[PDB]
Design a protein around this ligand. Sequence first.
Ligand SMILES: [Cu+2]
Ligand SMILES: [Cu+2]
Lengths: 187, 187
Amino acid sequence: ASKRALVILAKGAEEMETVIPVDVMRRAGIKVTVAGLAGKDPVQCSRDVVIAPDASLEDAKKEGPYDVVVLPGGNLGAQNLSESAAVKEILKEQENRKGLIAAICAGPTALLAHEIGFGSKVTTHPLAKDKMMNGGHYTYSENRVEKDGLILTSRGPGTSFEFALAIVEALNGKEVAAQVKAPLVLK
Amino acid sequence: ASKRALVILAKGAEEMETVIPVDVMRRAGIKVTVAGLAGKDPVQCSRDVVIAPDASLEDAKKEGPYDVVVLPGGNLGAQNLSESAAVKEILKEQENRKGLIAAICAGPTALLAHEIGFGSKVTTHPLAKDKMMNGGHYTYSENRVEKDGLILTSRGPGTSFEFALAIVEALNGKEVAAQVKAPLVLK
Ligand SMILES: [Cu+2]
Ligand SMILES: [Cu+2]
Protein backbone atom coordinates (compact mmCIF):
# COMPACT_ATOMS: atom_id res chain seq x y z
CA ALA A 1 0.00 0.00 0.00
CA SER A 2 1.21 3.49 -0.85
CA LYS A 3 1.94 6.19 1.73
CA ARG A 4 -0.51 9.11 1.95
CA ALA A 5 0.14 12.84 2.32
CA LEU A 6 -2.19 15.68 3.29
CA VAL A 7 -1.15 19.13 2.01
CA ILE A 8 -3.21 21.94 3.53
CA LEU A 9 -3.73 24.86 1.14
CA ALA A 10 -4.81 28.28 2.45
CA LYS A 11 -5.23 31.67 0.74
CA GLY A 12 -1.85 33.40 0.67
CA ALA A 13 0.18 30.18 0.61
CA GLU A 14 3.50 30.39 -1.24
CA GLU A 15 2.68 28.62 -4.51
CA MET A 16 6.23 27.35 -5.07
CA GLU A 17 6.32 25.81 -1.60
CA THR A 18 3.01 24.11 -2.34
CA VAL A 19 3.59 22.79 -5.87
CA ILE A 20 7.17 21.57 -5.43
CA PRO A 21 6.39 19.20 -2.54
CA VAL A 22 3.15 17.98 -4.17
CA ASP A 23 4.89 17.27 -7.46
CA VAL A 24 7.95 15.59 -5.89
CA MET A 25 5.81 13.46 -3.55
CA ARG A 26 3.70 12.27 -6.49
CA ARG A 27 6.90 11.42 -8.38
CA ALA A 28 7.69 9.24 -5.34
CA GLY A 29 4.40 7.35 -5.71
CA ILE A 30 2.90 8.97 -2.61
CA LYS A 31 -0.88 9.53 -2.77
CA VAL A 32 -1.14 13.27 -2.17
CA THR A 33 -4.37 15.06 -1.23
CA VAL A 34 -4.26 18.82 -1.72
CA ALA A 35 -6.96 20.05 0.64
CA GLY A 36 -8.39 23.56 0.67
CA LEU A 37 -8.58 25.10 4.13
CA ALA A 38 -11.63 27.21 3.26
CA GLY A 39 -13.53 24.68 1.14
CA LYS A 40 -13.49 23.13 -2.32
CA ASP A 41 -13.00 26.32 -4.36
CA PRO A 42 -9.71 27.31 -6.07
CA VAL A 43 -7.16 29.08 -3.84
CA GLN A 44 -5.40 32.38 -4.57
CA CYS A 45 -1.73 31.97 -3.62
CA SER A 46 0.72 34.72 -2.49
CA ARG A 47 1.90 35.62 -5.99
CA ASP A 48 -1.13 35.44 -8.11
CA VAL A 49 -1.25 31.73 -8.95
CA VAL A 50 -4.66 30.08 -8.55
CA ILE A 51 -4.68 26.39 -7.63
CA ALA A 52 -7.73 24.11 -7.46
CA PRO A 53 -7.51 21.72 -4.47
CA ASP A 54 -8.41 18.02 -4.74
CA ALA A 55 -10.87 18.31 -1.87
CA SER A 56 -11.98 20.55 0.98
CA LEU A 57 -10.10 20.09 4.27
CA GLU A 58 -13.47 19.34 5.85
CA ASP A 59 -13.80 16.27 3.63
CA ALA A 60 -10.12 15.24 3.54
CA LYS A 61 -9.73 15.27 7.32
CA LYS A 62 -12.36 12.52 7.44
CA GLU A 63 -10.27 10.29 5.16
CA GLY A 64 -7.25 9.99 7.45
CA PRO A 65 -4.96 9.02 8.84
CA TYR A 66 -2.10 10.35 6.71
CA ASP A 67 1.56 9.37 6.81
CA VAL A 68 2.57 13.04 6.60
CA VAL A 69 0.76 16.35 7.05
CA VAL A 70 2.44 19.11 5.06
CA LEU A 71 2.17 22.85 5.78
CA PRO A 72 3.35 25.18 2.99
CA GLY A 73 4.65 28.63 3.89
CA GLY A 74 3.89 32.13 2.71
CA ASN A 75 3.36 34.70 5.46
CA LEU A 76 -0.41 35.09 5.03
CA GLY A 77 -1.01 31.43 4.24
CA ALA A 78 0.70 30.46 7.48
CA GLN A 79 -1.38 33.01 9.44
CA ASN A 80 -4.52 31.37 8.06
CA LEU A 81 -3.25 27.92 9.10
CA SER A 82 -2.42 29.28 12.56
CA GLU A 83 -5.96 30.55 13.09
CA SER A 84 -7.75 27.35 12.08
CA ALA A 85 -9.39 25.01 14.59
CA ALA A 86 -9.47 22.22 12.01
CA VAL A 87 -5.70 22.47 11.49
CA LYS A 88 -5.16 22.41 15.25
CA GLU A 89 -7.13 19.17 15.55
CA ILE A 90 -5.39 17.53 12.59
CA LEU A 91 -1.90 18.36 13.86
CA LYS A 92 -2.66 17.22 17.42
CA GLU A 93 -3.97 13.91 16.11
CA GLN A 94 -0.93 13.46 13.86
CA GLU A 95 1.40 14.26 16.75
CA ASN A 96 -0.56 11.86 18.98
CA ARG A 97 -0.28 8.97 16.50
CA LYS A 98 3.42 9.66 16.02
CA GLY A 99 3.05 10.63 12.35
CA LEU A 100 5.33 12.96 10.40
CA ILE A 101 4.60 16.69 10.28
CA ALA A 102 6.43 18.76 7.66
CA ALA A 103 6.37 22.56 7.43
CA ILE A 104 8.35 24.99 5.28
CA CYS A 105 9.12 28.75 5.39
CA ALA A 106 6.50 30.52 7.54
CA GLY A 107 4.67 27.20 7.80
CA PRO A 108 6.37 26.18 11.04
CA THR A 109 4.83 29.18 12.86
CA ALA A 110 1.54 27.30 12.67
CA LEU A 111 3.17 24.59 14.80
CA LEU A 112 3.81 27.27 17.41
CA ALA A 113 0.22 28.52 17.24
CA HIS A 114 -1.12 25.00 17.83
CA GLU A 115 1.54 24.05 20.42
CA ILE A 116 2.98 21.26 18.30
CA GLY A 117 6.38 19.66 18.82
CA PHE A 118 7.64 21.97 21.58
CA GLY A 119 11.32 21.32 22.34
CA SER A 120 12.14 20.40 18.73
CA LYS A 121 15.03 21.84 16.77
CA VAL A 122 13.43 23.73 13.85
CA THR A 123 14.24 26.10 11.01
CA THR A 124 12.08 28.65 9.19
CA HIS A 125 12.43 31.42 6.67
CA PRO A 126 14.96 33.91 8.16
CA LEU A 127 12.20 36.55 8.25
CA ALA A 128 9.92 34.22 10.23
CA LYS A 129 12.47 33.39 12.94
CA ASP A 130 11.34 35.97 15.50
CA LYS A 131 7.73 34.83 15.23
CA MET A 132 8.67 31.15 15.60
CA MET A 133 10.95 31.83 18.57
CA ASN A 134 8.39 33.85 20.54
CA GLY A 135 8.54 32.29 24.02
CA GLY A 136 11.58 30.10 23.32
CA HIS A 137 9.58 26.90 22.77
CA TYR A 138 11.88 25.57 20.03
CA THR A 139 15.60 25.60 19.36
CA TYR A 140 16.46 27.42 16.12
CA SER A 141 18.58 25.93 13.37
CA GLU A 142 20.04 27.45 10.20
CA ASN A 143 20.18 24.11 8.37
CA ARG A 144 18.39 24.23 5.00
CA VAL A 145 16.28 21.26 6.09
CA GLU A 146 15.97 20.28 9.76
CA LYS A 147 14.48 17.05 11.07
CA ASP A 148 14.01 16.39 14.78
CA GLY A 149 12.16 13.10 15.12
CA LEU A 150 8.72 13.56 13.57
CA ILE A 151 9.03 17.33 13.02
CA LEU A 152 10.54 18.22 9.63
CA THR A 153 11.10 21.89 8.73
CA SER A 154 12.73 23.93 5.98
CA ARG A 155 13.51 27.51 5.05
CA GLY A 156 12.00 28.77 1.79
CA PRO A 157 11.27 28.42 -1.92
CA GLY A 158 14.91 27.62 -2.64
CA THR A 159 14.93 24.81 -0.08
CA SER A 160 11.66 23.30 -1.36
CA PHE A 161 13.30 20.50 -3.34
CA GLU A 162 15.49 19.47 -0.40
CA PHE A 163 12.41 19.62 1.87
CA ALA A 164 10.31 17.49 -0.49
CA LEU A 165 13.08 14.91 -0.96
CA ALA A 166 13.48 14.68 2.82
CA ILE A 167 9.78 13.82 3.12
CA VAL A 168 10.23 11.17 0.42
CA GLU A 169 13.24 9.68 2.25
CA ALA A 170 11.36 9.64 5.57
CA LEU A 171 8.37 7.85 4.03
CA ASN A 172 9.82 5.69 1.25
CA GLY A 173 13.55 5.44 1.99
CA LYS A 174 16.85 6.79 0.63
CA GLU A 175 16.87 4.71 -2.54
CA VAL A 176 13.49 5.99 -3.76
CA ALA A 177 14.50 9.55 -2.85
CA ALA A 178 17.69 9.16 -4.92
CA GLN A 179 15.74 7.75 -7.88
CA VAL A 180 13.24 10.62 -7.79
CA LYS A 181 16.04 13.16 -7.42
CA ALA A 182 18.07 12.31 -10.54
CA PRO A 183 15.64 13.44 -13.27
CA LEU A 184 15.02 16.78 -11.48
CA VAL A 185 18.43 18.10 -12.63
CA LEU A 186 19.29 19.51 -9.20
CA LYS A 187 22.77 20.90 -8.40
CA ALA B 1 6.35 51.13 -17.36
CA SER B 2 6.76 47.53 -16.24
CA LYS B 3 7.94 44.71 -18.49
CA ARG B 4 5.35 42.12 -19.57
CA ALA B 5 5.59 38.33 -19.79
CA LEU B 6 3.36 35.79 -21.53
CA VAL B 7 3.47 32.27 -20.06
CA ILE B 8 1.68 29.71 -22.23
CA LEU B 9 0.04 26.94 -20.21
CA ALA B 10 -0.99 23.66 -21.87
CA LYS B 11 -2.38 20.39 -20.47
CA GLY B 12 0.54 18.23 -19.33
CA ALA B 13 2.83 21.17 -18.54
CA GLU B 14 5.31 20.58 -15.71
CA GLU B 15 3.69 22.51 -12.85
CA MET B 16 6.99 23.32 -11.12
CA GLU B 17 8.41 24.76 -14.34
CA THR B 18 5.30 26.89 -14.69
CA VAL B 19 4.84 28.19 -11.14
CA ILE B 20 8.50 28.93 -10.35
CA PRO B 21 9.03 31.32 -13.28
CA VAL B 22 5.61 32.99 -12.79
CA ASP B 23 6.25 33.54 -9.08
CA VAL B 24 9.84 34.77 -9.53
CA MET B 25 8.89 37.11 -12.39
CA ARG B 26 6.10 38.62 -10.28
CA ARG B 27 8.58 39.10 -7.43
CA ALA B 28 10.60 41.09 -9.99
CA GLY B 29 7.65 43.40 -10.68
CA ILE B 30 7.06 41.92 -14.13
CA LYS B 31 3.40 41.86 -15.25
CA VAL B 32 2.86 38.16 -15.98
CA THR B 33 -0.08 36.79 -17.96
CA VAL B 34 -0.62 33.05 -17.55
CA ALA B 35 -2.53 32.13 -20.70
CA GLY B 36 -4.31 28.84 -21.27
CA LEU B 37 -3.55 27.26 -24.63
CA ALA B 38 -6.96 25.58 -24.86
CA GLY B 39 -9.11 28.37 -23.43
CA LYS B 40 -10.01 29.98 -20.11
CA ASP B 41 -10.63 26.80 -18.10
CA PRO B 42 -8.24 25.43 -15.42
CA VAL B 43 -5.36 23.31 -16.73
CA GLN B 44 -4.38 19.83 -15.53
CA CYS B 45 -0.57 19.73 -15.21
CA SER B 46 1.74 16.67 -15.54
CA ARG B 47 1.58 15.70 -11.86
CA ASP B 48 -1.94 16.32 -10.85
CA VAL B 49 -1.85 20.03 -10.02
CA VAL B 50 -4.70 22.10 -11.48
CA ILE B 51 -3.94 25.73 -12.27
CA ALA B 52 -6.44 28.39 -13.39
CA PRO B 53 -4.94 30.66 -16.09
CA ASP B 54 -5.40 34.45 -16.04
CA ALA B 55 -6.79 34.41 -19.57
CA SER B 56 -7.18 32.28 -22.68
CA LEU B 57 -4.28 32.42 -25.15
CA GLU B 58 -6.81 33.56 -27.73
CA ASP B 59 -7.46 36.70 -25.68
CA ALA B 60 -3.92 37.24 -24.37
CA LYS B 61 -2.31 37.09 -27.80
CA LYS B 62 -4.38 40.15 -28.73
CA GLU B 63 -2.88 42.13 -25.84
CA GLY B 64 0.73 42.00 -26.99
CA PRO B 65 3.46 42.63 -27.53
CA TYR B 66 5.26 40.99 -24.61
CA ASP B 67 8.85 41.48 -23.48
CA VAL B 68 9.25 37.72 -23.04
CA VAL B 69 7.27 34.67 -24.13
CA VAL B 70 7.83 31.76 -21.75
CA LEU B 71 7.34 28.07 -22.60
CA PRO B 72 7.23 25.67 -19.63
CA GLY B 73 8.29 22.06 -20.13
CA GLY B 74 6.75 18.72 -19.35
CA ASN B 75 6.82 16.17 -22.17
CA LEU B 76 3.10 16.28 -23.02
CA GLY B 77 2.76 20.01 -22.38
CA ALA B 78 5.55 20.67 -24.86
CA GLN B 79 3.92 18.38 -27.45
CA ASN B 80 0.73 20.44 -27.14
CA LEU B 81 2.71 23.67 -27.63
CA SER B 82 4.45 22.13 -30.65
CA GLU B 83 1.14 21.32 -32.35
CA SER B 84 -0.45 24.75 -31.91
CA ALA B 85 -0.85 27.22 -34.77
CA ALA B 86 -1.42 30.06 -32.30
CA VAL B 87 1.90 29.33 -30.57
CA LYS B 88 3.66 29.24 -33.95
CA GLU B 89 2.33 32.70 -34.81
CA ILE B 90 3.19 34.17 -31.41
CA LEU B 91 6.77 32.87 -31.47
CA LYS B 92 7.37 34.01 -35.06
CA GLU B 93 6.15 37.50 -34.18
CA GLN B 94 8.31 37.60 -31.04
CA GLU B 95 11.33 36.45 -33.02
CA ASN B 96 10.55 39.02 -35.72
CA ARG B 97 10.36 41.91 -33.23
CA LYS B 98 13.58 40.76 -31.57
CA GLY B 99 11.90 39.92 -28.25
CA LEU B 100 13.09 37.36 -25.71
CA ILE B 101 11.88 33.76 -25.92
CA ALA B 102 12.47 31.53 -22.89
CA ALA B 103 11.85 27.78 -22.77
CA ILE B 104 12.68 25.16 -20.15
CA CYS B 105 12.95 21.33 -20.08
CA ALA B 106 10.98 19.86 -23.01
CA GLY B 107 9.78 23.38 -23.79
CA PRO B 108 12.57 24.11 -26.26
CA THR B 109 11.34 21.29 -28.56
CA ALA B 110 8.44 23.59 -29.42
CA LEU B 111 11.02 26.02 -30.83
CA LEU B 112 12.13 23.22 -33.14
CA ALA B 113 8.56 22.44 -34.19
CA HIS B 114 7.95 26.10 -35.11
CA GLU B 115 11.41 26.64 -36.66
CA ILE B 116 12.42 29.27 -34.12
CA GLY B 117 15.98 30.40 -33.46
CA PHE B 118 17.76 27.88 -35.70
CA GLY B 119 21.54 28.04 -35.20
CA SER B 120 21.24 28.92 -31.50
CA LYS B 121 23.12 27.17 -28.72
CA VAL B 122 20.41 25.57 -26.54
CA THR B 123 19.94 23.18 -23.65
CA THR B 124 16.98 20.96 -22.69
CA HIS B 125 16.13 18.22 -20.26
CA PRO B 126 18.66 15.40 -20.89
CA LEU B 127 15.77 13.14 -21.94
CA ALA B 128 14.59 15.69 -24.51
CA LYS B 129 17.97 16.13 -26.20
CA ASP B 130 17.43 13.66 -29.05
CA LYS B 131 14.11 15.27 -29.96
CA MET B 132 15.58 18.78 -29.91
CA MET B 133 18.61 17.75 -31.99
CA ASN B 134 16.60 16.04 -34.74
CA GLY B 135 18.08 17.49 -37.94
CA GLY B 136 20.98 19.28 -36.23
CA HIS B 137 19.34 22.73 -36.30
CA TYR B 138 20.76 23.81 -32.92
CA THR B 139 24.01 23.32 -31.07
CA TYR B 140 23.52 21.47 -27.77
CA SER B 141 24.79 22.74 -24.44
CA GLU B 142 24.92 21.10 -21.00
CA ASN B 143 24.88 24.44 -19.16
CA ARG B 144 22.08 24.63 -16.56
CA VAL B 145 20.85 27.82 -18.22
CA GLU B 146 21.89 28.75 -21.77
CA LYS B 147 21.34 32.12 -23.42
CA ASP B 148 22.21 32.75 -27.06
CA GLY B 149 21.02 36.24 -27.92
CA LEU B 150 17.22 36.26 -27.61
CA ILE B 151 16.85 32.50 -27.06
CA LEU B 152 17.04 31.49 -23.39
CA THR B 153 16.79 27.80 -22.43
CA SER B 154 17.15 25.63 -19.35
CA ARG B 155 17.11 22.00 -18.29
CA GLY B 156 14.46 21.01 -15.74
CA PRO B 157 12.60 21.54 -12.46
CA GLY B 158 15.88 21.88 -10.57
CA THR B 159 17.10 24.61 -12.92
CA SER B 160 13.81 26.55 -12.75
CA PHE B 161 15.06 29.16 -10.28
CA GLU B 162 18.21 29.84 -12.31
CA PHE B 163 16.05 30.03 -15.47
CA ALA B 164 13.59 32.47 -13.89
CA LEU B 165 16.35 34.68 -12.48
CA ALA B 166 18.00 34.77 -15.91
CA ILE B 167 14.75 36.09 -17.39
CA VAL B 168 14.63 38.73 -14.64
CA GLU B 169 18.23 39.77 -15.34
CA ALA B 170 17.57 39.99 -19.10
CA LEU B 171 14.50 42.18 -18.59
CA ASN B 172 15.22 44.20 -15.44
CA GLY B 173 18.98 43.94 -14.90
CA LYS B 174 21.45 42.21 -12.56
CA GLU B 175 20.69 44.34 -9.52
CA VAL B 176 16.97 43.54 -9.51
CA ALA B 177 17.75 39.85 -10.11
CA ALA B 178 20.10 39.87 -7.10
CA GLN B 179 17.49 41.59 -4.92
CA VAL B 180 14.81 39.07 -5.88
CA LYS B 181 17.22 36.17 -5.37
CA ALA B 182 18.21 36.82 -1.74
CA PRO B 183 14.89 36.08 0.01
CA LEU B 184 14.47 32.81 -1.94
CA VAL B 185 17.11 31.08 0.23
CA LEU B 186 18.86 29.50 -2.76
CA LYS B 187 22.20 27.65 -2.40
CU1 LIG C 1 8.15 31.22 1.68
CU1 LIG D 1 10.51 19.09 -16.95
